[PDB]
Subunit: 230 residues, 2 copies
């Protein structure tokens, strides 16, 4: 349900959809199906077992609230472990055996590898960062003089689709679903859907409304103030 708005001009549904995809790879966080599993299992669990029945759900124990709070606590714990690990690992090498940033990354990686693995498993990001990619970005951060937090912000948040590998984004399989012809221009109220392999960008188009402006003159003599209460 990640939602973003975009102004466009007079474009066809095709061109508007392609601008939407450009902005999708730029702006939206990357599609992580692992982050979607819990809901599915919860739904399936309700499958394993109408107003009064919902009433009894409210009177029941909210497992989801406490599970989310505990998971948030665990994620913050793993995050602080990871920050300490990466700070110590960057402090293990001096700028000045002389070695290139690739060998420096390979030298300091085993002192951050377990904490990073645990954080990427607790945030379900382990399928998006291979060890080779982590070493590549690590030598990148060592080369460009970045801090542990600058290295680590790629791994803390989910991040958009273009942070990741080229086989990760399936630019080839996008499918434009429009009720009308896709060569028709945009108008108010049309809905087109850009379907990928497992998700879909439901895009509804609204007209930017007709706006009326009018001057009213506020005199700087009218900005008087008194010490009395209001």
């Amino acid at each position: 349900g990640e939602s973003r708005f975009y102004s466009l001009g007079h474009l066809s549904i095709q061109r508007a959809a392609l601008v939407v995809l450009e902005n999708y790879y730029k702006d939206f966080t990357i599609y992580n199906p692992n982050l979607l599993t819990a809901s599915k299992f919860r739904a399936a669990k309700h499958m394993a077992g109408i107003a009064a029945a919902a009433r009894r759900r409210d009177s029941s124990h909210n497992e989801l609230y406490y599970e989310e709070a505990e998971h948030e606590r665990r994620v913050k714990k793993r995050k602080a472990r990871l920050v300490v690990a990466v700070e110590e690992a960057f402090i293990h090498i001096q700028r000045l055996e002389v070695m290139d940033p690739r060998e420096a990354a390979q030298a300091i990686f085993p002192s951050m590898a377990r904490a990073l693995q645990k954080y990427l498993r607790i945030t379900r990001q382990q399928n998006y960062h291979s060890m080779e990619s982590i070493l590549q970005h690590l030598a990148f951060c060592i080369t460009n003089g970045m801090t542990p937090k600058a290295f680590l912000e790629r791994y803390l948040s989910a991040g958009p689709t273009l942070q990741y590998d080229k086989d990760r984004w399936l630019s080839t399989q996008w499918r434009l679903v429009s009720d009308e012809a896709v060569t028709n221009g945009l108008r108010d109220g049309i809905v087109f859907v850009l379907k990928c392999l497992d998700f879909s960008l439901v895009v509804n188009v609204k007209k930017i409304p007709f706006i009326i402006l009018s001057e009213e003159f506020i005199d700087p003599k009218s900005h008087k103030f008194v010490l009395r209460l209001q």
Copy 2:
């Protein structure tokens, strides 16, 4: 499962059981079956639905931990509400219309009645304090110059059986269950059970062990100390 120990001399099981009952009405908190309902319902709920099956229970959500924490939070909230209510209600009357402590209790009770009712319902003590008894103890506290907390400590904790009304303790229906004759004296290892209408005092008797003492002489010359670390 409230458990207390008592030393006794050479008594028969009858006399030891009666000392146990004297100390029961003195020392043990009063039998509250309402506080026992939750477990029963939980058991019945497990009835509504062997090592691996327990393993899966550990991997499940611990509803009881969070429910107990939330109930404790609610009890403390109601407790602070009750303390503020009773403090304001006692501050509404001066020692110095002139009225006896009964009418003073009836005058200040409606300013504490709702908070006290909510606290006795959240602690499941509403069947143990009638309004007449609360007014009686309230006029008692107003008479003897006690503070709001001194009035309120009867209602905060569960309290033993003799705080409450005379029909509350069923002194007449106690039943002594012993495997041997109850006129026999106590010895090591015997178990007798004092059954009331819904609970039972399981009492096991142990011998106070044979103790050997011996002098060792610690010289006050041997209490020397140095500033060095240990």
